[PDB]
Amino acid sequence: LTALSPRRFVVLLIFSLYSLVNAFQWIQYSIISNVFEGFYGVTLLHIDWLSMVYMLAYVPLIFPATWLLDTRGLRLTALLGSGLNCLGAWIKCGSVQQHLFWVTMLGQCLCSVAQVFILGLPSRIASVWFGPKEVSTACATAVLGNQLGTAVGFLLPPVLVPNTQNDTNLLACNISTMFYGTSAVATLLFILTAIAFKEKPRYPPSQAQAALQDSPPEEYSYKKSIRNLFKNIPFVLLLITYGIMTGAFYSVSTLLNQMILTYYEGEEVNAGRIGLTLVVAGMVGSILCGLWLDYTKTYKQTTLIVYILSFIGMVIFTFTLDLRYIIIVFVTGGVLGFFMTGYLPLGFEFAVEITYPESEGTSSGLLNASAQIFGILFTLAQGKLTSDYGPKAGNIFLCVWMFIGIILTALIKSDLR
């Protein structure tokens, strides 16, 4: 007896909404990083670390959290993901002062820990609550909810918080309003999670989950899985190319305010819409990419073409910022964003196919961990280059690294799909 419960829409909607808030909080500081420079009396390096602890905290905590999710259940991970997101947001609301940067540093640390319990959920929620035909779209919706958070995170903070650096009292009110609004939304979603997020439906929704429910997962071993994934060389190369592709997206998103503001002074609002275009277009590309793979070509050919086009994406983007035309940044940012974050569906689906005899829990974790490691290195490197030799030097650094990504992608041997 397998049936679909109406609660699955509520569970999916609740998770997508508090995934939006957590992803909103990752980029809310970086998009107005020039505002927080004068508010805290703090250099750009610390403000970049606000968006980078989202990546630093993910690397060590991903696998113990996956162990917690695979052993305790969906509800505890959901409660911890929303609970720490709500707790991290509430700490920030008390950090709106000129001498309390560590308080907002501590608050962002909790949100980064919350992301560990959020990013691994979308694949599990669809496979537990949704029937066989709707697993793919339910999984896609949850990830798009996280990407939609970045889109809102790019657009709203510039609107909510103007520069107003010559009036600190008025500046403090706007920052507190954004923090108060973020915590209030996160608190409501945590309350809903504690109420509506059931552990599992009354009956399994799919035939595969009914069979899988009878098998205890205590026989799994994470040490064997990670060690076995580095033995085969095709996956190691893909772990690097995906990290470069996704890490470049994190580096650009974190430093988008710095590159835009030096050429266009006072256009921090427009930098938000460029960030929105850079990721909304990727959402369109991600949807189109999913319908693209099983319609014309194979995984290897498609992932090389997108990577080649993604490299061309910033080559035009690198050499169009200096043109001093704001319209050109919108189009080039969208074209670059159509392929930068349109590759993540390609990265995940390519890896899971070439890793059949190994569980997708670790392969997905390693790919995300690879993105965090490269995102930290790129932001640290591009941040110094931009702050010293101009944004063109910083962007060329990313262009060089995708050239390595194209070469490494071409060396992968695969024929699946």
Numbering used by the authors: 100 to 516
Paper text:
We determined structures of FLVCR1 and FLVCR2 in as-isolated (without exogenous addition of ligands), inward-facing conformations at 2.9 Å resolution. The inward-facing conformations of FLVCR1 and FLVCR2 exhibit a close resemblance to each other, with a root mean square deviation (Cα r.m.s.d.) of 0.993 Å. Both structures feature a wedge-shaped solvent-accessible cavity that is mainly created by the separation of TM4 and TM5 of the N domain from TM10 and TM11 of the C domain. Although FLVCR1 exhibits a similar extracellular hydrogen-bonding network as FLVCR2, it lacks a corresponding salt bridge interaction. Notably, the disruption of the hydrogen bond between N133FLVCR1 and N359FLVCR1 (structurally analogous to N110FLVCR2 and N332FLVCR2) through an alanine substitution of N133FLVCR1 markedly diminishes the transport activity of FLVCR1 for both choline and ethanolamine. Of note, although the as-isolated, inward-facing and outward-facing conformations of FLVCR2 represent apo states of the transporter, we observed an extra non-protein density within the substrate-binding cleft of the as-isolated FLVCR1 structure. Introducing choline and ethanolamine to FLVCR1 leads to displacement of this unidentified molecule, evident from the altered size and shape of the specific densities for choline and ethanolamine in the respective electron microscopy maps. The precise nature of this ligand remains unknown. It is, however, conceivable that FLVCR1 is copurified with a blend of choline and ethanolamine, creating an indistinct density for these ligands or alternatively with a yet-unidentified ligand.
